[PDB]
Amino acid sequence: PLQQTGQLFGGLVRDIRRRYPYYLSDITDAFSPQVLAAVIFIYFAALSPAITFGGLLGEKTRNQMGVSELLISTAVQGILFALLGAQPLLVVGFSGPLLVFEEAFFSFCETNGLEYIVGRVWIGFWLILLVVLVVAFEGSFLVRFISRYTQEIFSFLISLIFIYETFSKLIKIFQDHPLQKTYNYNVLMVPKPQGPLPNTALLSLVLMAGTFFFAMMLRKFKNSSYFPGKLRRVIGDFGVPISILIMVLVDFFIQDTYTQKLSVPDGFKVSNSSARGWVIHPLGLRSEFPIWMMFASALPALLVFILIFLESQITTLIVSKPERKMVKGSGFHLDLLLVVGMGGVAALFGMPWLSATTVRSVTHANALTVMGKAQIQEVKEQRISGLLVAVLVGLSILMEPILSRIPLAVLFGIFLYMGVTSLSGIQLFDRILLLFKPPKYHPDVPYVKRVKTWRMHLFTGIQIICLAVLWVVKSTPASLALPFVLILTVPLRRVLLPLIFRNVELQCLDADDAKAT
């Protein structure tokens, strides 16, 4: 699918012919309870980050873009991607680097006295031009140069970031309500508690730990030998919904203690009615838009395109590995085109652009993965799951009474479960574990029986330095340069690694399909 045809829009046409014949199967393959369980999982797994990022965006942009706009954009883009995409298992939503770019662009517009939302409109206008040129010239064929090295480094780094943020949210909850001998029993609760409250942080920790424990125990029960096999697999598929329901009920039966809940806007309205409407004029809302900024928007549009391209294409590489039993094909050109086009269109309506997030899409693929008698058997590849997730995200405003009783701590345990389960398929994580094992306990794999132990440990340690460098870049104001540093690993793999490792060693350690050279 990554070959270069040489024909204008050749990759786009091939991706359409690859997947659209399977459209009838993409509806009938969802007739299983595992698909419904995956829908319930991904609904929360996409709604909670959407709510958090919308709140942060509203705080950092004076509510020009907020929770409601992000939710509506997520719903529309998810529906259109599920109906028309070539890899429907990808989950389309907001991400951290996008929030960093929004912060930087808002600061730039505030410094120069520019309208932030109109600048976003012009960037999205420049986004549509860039993606069509890439699709026309089959620019997505460059993804074939991203080997398992960069993919696994990026996946491990993103999982570590997800776990770190999940723990840091609990740390922030503990800081907001510290353990003290005395508390003020008269503290205002609207809109948020203005002072420390008893039993809050400890109950949040208990709920998070219980959610994680129940999720892990039900995941083990799926592979366990207990109960009849059909009922056992049915319970194991619904493990995350069962854990969420149990912990939500546990928190519900504790009336006196306060726990932070999910918050959604009252209705389908703009976050700031005094700032902008549903349609933003490209010529300017309050002041006339400068001519020079219309042409100067290409460079931020270039950065956005680079970020979205790297995120979506690496996520597609991860979810479409041959070892994951993907027997329906993926379209790199079509999915990128749809994502960037939907982002550019949503820019016109004052809505944030999205990208195929690694954690959510990997969790969606794993939730649809059927395990054989250990060995992956098949994947429930269908369009119904993503469409239903997007519909439920859009309807999240209308189901506020249901969402208002769901604590964030249960969602934190769910996030921790997703983070720990996203490391199963990464060989980098496995080789990191081999650093703490005797050589005789190493599994019978091509990169152990054909490569010396110290050579393999050195190869793993080289990736660890890359992980440390990527982590340092994230913790700096220049965090938008992360895609470039990630790309810089490809010259390391293709040039510097052969200077110190043999061809057979590199083939065993870095294999596209886990083969013995």
Partner: protein, 40 residues
């Protein structure tokens, strides 16, 4: 829109149609140039 917005000569559908037409013209020019190259 919302509140009071500055009045422009072109409305939002008109300006977005003009921008899309300019973008389509640029894309067509680039495609024609690429078609011309790799042949002579």
């Amino acid at each position: 829109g919302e509140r009071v917005q500055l009045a422009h000569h072109f409305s939002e559908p008109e300006i977005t149609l003009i921008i899309f037409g300019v973008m389509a013209g640029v894309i067509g020019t680039i495609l024609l140039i690429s078609y011309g190259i790799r042949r002579l």
